[PDB]
Design a protein around this ligand. Structure first.
Ligand code: NA
Ligand code: NA
Ligand code: NA
Lengths: 597, 597, 597
């Protein structure tokens, strides 16, 4: 009778409870208090209500989905995925998420506290899957939003180690969808071959989505995998912080990127990356411009630690027939990055910053400007010929480098013959320290190899801090590169023994608004006059020089060459020296040649 | 009998429980285990103990207060504000918090896990309110402390959208009070017209208070609102990190500031701001000096992302009759900030740094020094005439700028006629990159417009990275500004066509300890002597010049002007050139004029 | 009968429950739901299962250990240490942790949510203790791992204020051991005399361990304490963020360090330190190289706020007979640090960076290179003679300084006679601002006091921003220091009245590959020739000078000295000036002396 009610599922609803025997507290039943929390256990049962234990040969999907659906009906709450158990997912979800190869449909206000482990069963071997999907429709253009959905805890999402069946397939952990105020915190995503672990937003739709204190371990494992970017941030006001990214597979060194930032006001900070090809893409893709507009601005990549095999930060923008993408107002700072131990050319070209062409290779679609790269450290082993502070392979409308430390093969690089980027507002401040790891490795190479269509409104202030006499030059402009309204200086320190310092193969330094200084060795001859006496350069290629001054001591007693020189119409330098005793003098002097500076 | 006990509120205290049937575990009753957690449900009942459902026409205040009071009595714990429900607050609290228009009194060690939503009912329309108040007295000087009180979860505090009834009113979300080890984490504060969302500490009393991962959305909405600063940090060793601040109302663009730091060892980092007038105030107010002293030092504003309409960081200090405020040891770094799209002068003057006068307008009370602004990016649209790296409107005892990128109308600015600040130790390192967005907009304007009473021990190293021939000058000192013991240089790059580079309207560059260099165009005439021959400037205003050198090529064959010049007592420049053939020469040359450098 | 079962410990296992009366939910018993959580209460009982209340005269150790052991047996979970109670620990643990003076053995997957307080009883007075130990063996070489063990909450670990019994003793809060994915979050560690609060990893074994949002308050209190480092990070991919460290005891000012980073890819960020001797050690100890190798690389100390009494960041590496330690790829940025108010020499020598000798004092074992120090602020009161940007006391293979602000007594310092460090690749960029707080205090002192065995491949670009005529020199090299292949420049600004600017006591600036410029005052005499006329220096010590130029105005009408000078074999400077009227001229001029620059 009463016994029957008590042993029934309604029993706890008949056992009274008052918080700590407080007479002022609500008189409730045990069931009410138990109803304040909810776990997978409360839905992980057979049609008869008997609990099912999870494991290898149990598909937890439908039970988890029921839990999510039921809590969604009550306006939200948090479902615990209990510790001490692994909950295997063994089938595709149905309805709206079936188009996304979804396993589980996330729902608004329904949080998952994942304390235990979630593993994909062999069913998903060689198949595409997106484990959690916040889209409510197969077509995301027609999907509703996912709001206030947080996945967090000390738990694990394990992708079972299965390889991709085909390169064309997609795999994700959490596809939040058109996602507003959603986050993933504390979760370890491990043991997979996936396209992404997490995607935030959809073509700019979404806001305030974050990945914090998560771990991403060994999420590429096959040559089948076309591409990996662990977190793809595709909504504004969103980002990644204090995360850990690690790959061991050789394939990851060629295809894997830790983060992509694709919308405005997004960030990547305080994270550690190891074994990846790439740190981050920072890009406005025209195709993703619907939600938040055509401009990726306020892009922050800060205070990260990376060992990568390719490019740390890749800037881009591209266009569609109808929309043009723009990237501006980017800051890259405080990052300490190195190219991991590898053979030259054995992975994509090493670079701190890459200005990349779009996905179809186009290098004349880009609109990237107002980028500040500052207070970063970059290092590549001496052997890694393909390493650069910046690989500038596409049109650049501005990039500012200040107070960085770059210890790699090239400072500014682009391959000759390939793209011919149009370059505006490239600023390499003199405060960028050029490291010495690659000294004596630069035979035939130009430290700044300005392989561009044109350079305008740019500053290159070259400052060495050690000798490298192996390099062909500190900076070289091929005749094909136009240079105008630019400042190019090579500080004399450690350059005394250099044959070429700055090289302008088309004599571009003669430009009306080109401001240059660099050291050169010059032969001079004087008239025989006793007293104040002119010295002239034997060669006549200094028509562009506004002043020059000596960088050599004068070994002689009976005379001295001029300390300072100007030029003459015929291209000679001319200065006034002093013959204590008369006689024609002939000397070879190291000069700082200067034009308008 | 037994049935009666079981169905009574004491029933759960009669049902035994042993954790997982472990014989080594404590033999308890269900009630004991249920007593480990506590929710608003346990106090949200009528006088008869029957639960009351929350909602529009239910005032949850007294029940929440009872819960807090009861848990406070047991030494603390955490009350859950359940998800899936909105709990409306409908009346003022009583006792100590009545003076603060408090709704709820917070108590020490009593945490609130806000998972559901908390909404203010229409009762508070046009009224002042402080939702949570940690003061235990109407007079904060006589208030006890709030300790170890943490508010956190995925929940929402909603201010109901009500406007201020009068500008004189105050509104707050969490007024922690004299607050030690208190924090707010994860909470969304939205939909209001408030003075602040959160205040930490009281006039320097308090420690270790933080706002982390919170969102602040649309918390100004009326022209009635006198002022808004979302988080006001008024105790040391406290700060804001990884928060999101957003306003849409036009009124916010004129009055709203995201953060104020008012005490030592405080920080604002990793946050995103949009639609605000101001990023942060960093200030020592004499009036708030009781708790932590008279010095705001160790002030950090780092790695934030902002779109604002006024000033990013505002430095200040002021005084009372008895106390003088001091601000020092501040760091502003890594921030990427822009002035949002607006008409010139349509909001408070755009500035990355503002040295502001105190609240009564005084500009001669300030003691601000040892500030480092570094590795920040600042951008304002070309149209925004009122935009500056620094608006220096009050006395400055030091500010150091290094390796920043500033792309706005002015670098250093102050309005003429207005304040006449006394300036010491302003350091604008040459590594600050000056952007080109405002090139061709600067007609009648001085890039560095040194409208001060005096400048001493200062460095301005002007380096352009593109042409702007529209500007009247790169730097101008009016005669009213004293200049001494300072270094002022204008790099020649992109300046060749400029009429004025550095302008000293009172000839201040002649000062004994003024160190300057800038380009000037100078007319010279030579004697007729064949051979080494002097050239002299026709004008006699170079009495201050220690050396000059050519920045022009020499078009002539038969002679060359001097490469380098010194001066003469009468103010002429004089150099020694060379007449291959005799004849009086007359030339106009671009020179780098130098004084003691 | 039924009553008997219900009042028994099995009773809750007989009371049915179905989540919110949902017919689709699992039919369970109350006990099942209660079994989803676990607290110290469930094991804090006598042999008869009756609960024991915690407190002063109750030793909670065995009960907590039983709880941990039991949850470990079920594959993990989280034990709550309830709020509102203090749980005293009163004895040593047993077995594997007995060797580590362990109190509690941590176990994998078993998290502790510490909401209440944990206090050490008087038993531990004058004794060594490690409160939580994740080693499972007395010998860590033979210990298994601790994995997925997280300690977190709003609770407190209190060390009872007991002093060390002897300097030889060790004391720790959490010794995670060979620790993989373990963390401590939110916990206050207070009131002790300990060696550390937390240690992560063991000699490089471990990964992904973190200390976040923790507080460390007054953890040194006796002159007995040999040494303190609050968090010791001894496994890679691990770090400290957003923590608070505070000491009040005078002893802490001499022995206490906030953090040590001893393995690769480790970080210390966003933290506030007060009252400590030292901010961080960043070091590769040969002895700790077993787990993660011989290289500490990717070391990040960023965005911290410190008031310390000694050295902010101490770099080191040392060796064993068999292993050599290496430190490279370090970044120190964004930190705002000051030496607290103290008497000169009353604590270890104040320094932003210290290149320290190893523990046995050796200064010739170090291999430290590719360090970048950038965008930091450092300040020491004017009185603190012992304050330096860098104390360089041991061999340095590279350190790069850019865009810092240093306001202390020395920029570069080492005590004479003591160590004679060999120095390579020291780069002090011109963008480092030198503050004025110590102006007029530097009598007998060299701002850069290059007390080394040798300097090579180094850059010192000295830029003052105010006068200090008290200093003996801006930079001085004793004869014992070799200098080669280096650049040393002193900017002329604020140096006009200085007797010595750069001093080379062994004439090292004459080196073939030494590139220098600095101001000097020079006496010149001319020949009597009317017209172009040479001026020569009276002194003959400029054999090394490649060019010089005037930094003085010419007071005379009838002549002018040369604007620019070269030299002659005998060591004289020589230039060509102009005698309007003939006569031997004699002048004293301030020159910028230049060698190869
Ligand atoms: Na071209
Ligand atoms: Na004045
Ligand atoms: Na030596």
């Amino acid at each position: 009778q009463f016994r029957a009610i008590i042993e029934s599922p309604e029993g706890a609803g008949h056992v009274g409870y008052q918080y700590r025997r407080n007479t002022g507290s609500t008189m409730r039943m045990v069931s009410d208090v138990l109803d304040e929390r909810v776990s997978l256990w409360d839905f992980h049962c057979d049609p008869s209500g008997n609990v099912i234990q999870p494991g290898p040969n149990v598909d937890s999907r439908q039970y988890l989905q029921a839990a999510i659906d039921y809590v969604s009906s009550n306006g939200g709450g948090t479902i615990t995925i209990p510790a001490g158990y692994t909950w295997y997912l063994g089938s595709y979800g149905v309805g709206g998420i079936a188009g996304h190869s979804g396993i589980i449909q996330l729902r608004s206000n329904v949080n998952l506290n994942i304390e235990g482990r979630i593993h994909l069963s062999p069913f998903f071997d060689l198949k595409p899957f997106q484990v959690f999907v916040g889209f409510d429709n197969g077509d995301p253009a027609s999907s509703g939003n996912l709001e206030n959905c947080h996945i967090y805890g000390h738990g694990v999402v394990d992708f079972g180690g299965y390889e991709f069946g085909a390169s064309s397939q997609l795999r994700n952990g959490v596809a939040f969808g058109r996602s507003y105020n959603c986050s993933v915190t504390g979760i370890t995503f491990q043991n997979g071959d996936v396209t992404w672990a997490i995607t935030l937003g959809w073509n700019g739709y979404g806001s305030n989505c974050y990945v914090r204190k998560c771990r991403f371990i060994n999420l590429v494992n096959s040559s089948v995998n076309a591409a990996h970017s662990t977190v793809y941030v595709n909504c504004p006001y969103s980002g990644v912080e204090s995360c850990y990214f690690s790959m061991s597979s050789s394939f990851a060194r060629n295809i894997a990127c830790s983060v992509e930032l694709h919308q405005h006001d997004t960030f990547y900070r305080g994270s550690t990356v190891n074994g990846y090809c790439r740190g981050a893409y920072v890009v406005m893709h025209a195709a993703e411009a619907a939600g938040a507009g055509s401009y990726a601005y306020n892009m922050q990549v800060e205070n990260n630690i990376a060992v990568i095999y390719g490019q740390f930060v890749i800037l881009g923008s591209d266009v569609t027939a109808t929309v043009s993408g723009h990237l501006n107002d980017v800051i890259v700072s405080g990052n300490i990055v190195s190219i991991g131990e590898r053979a030259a050319f054995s992975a994509p070209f090493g670079a701190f910053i890459d200005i990349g062409p779009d996905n179809s290779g186009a290098s004349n679609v880009q609109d990237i400007q107002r980028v500040l790269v500052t207070g970063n450290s970059f290092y590549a082993p001496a052997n890694i010929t393909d390493s650069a502070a910046i690989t500038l392979r596409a049109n650049l409308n501005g990039c500012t480098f200040i107070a960085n430390n770059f210890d790699c093969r090239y400072m500014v690089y682009n391959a000759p013959g390939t793209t011919s980027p149009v370059v505006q507002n490239l600023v390499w401040d003199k405060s960028n320290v050029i490291g010495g790891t690659h000294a004596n490795q630069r035979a035939g190479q130009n430290l700044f190899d300005m392989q561009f269509a044109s350079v305008v409104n740019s500053t290159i202030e070259v400052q060495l801090s050690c000798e490298d006499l192996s390099m062909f030059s500190c900076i070289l402009f091929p005749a094909s590169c136009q240079l105008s309204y630019s400042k190019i200086t090579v500080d004399s320190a450690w350059t005394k023994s250099m044959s070429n310092t700055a090289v302008f193969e088309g004599n571009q330094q003669a430009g009306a608004n080109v401001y240059v200084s660099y050291p050169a060795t010059v032969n001079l001859t004087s008239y025989n006059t006793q007293g104040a006496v002119p010295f002239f350069s034997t060669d006549t290629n200094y028509a562009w020089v506004t002043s020059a001054y000596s960088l050599s001591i004068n070994e002689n007693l009976d005379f001295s060459p001029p300390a300072t020189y100007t030029n003459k119409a015929n291209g000679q330098l001319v200065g006034v020296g002093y013959n204590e005793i008369g006689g024609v003098r002939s000397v070879s002097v190291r000069l700082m040649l200067q034009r308008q500076v």
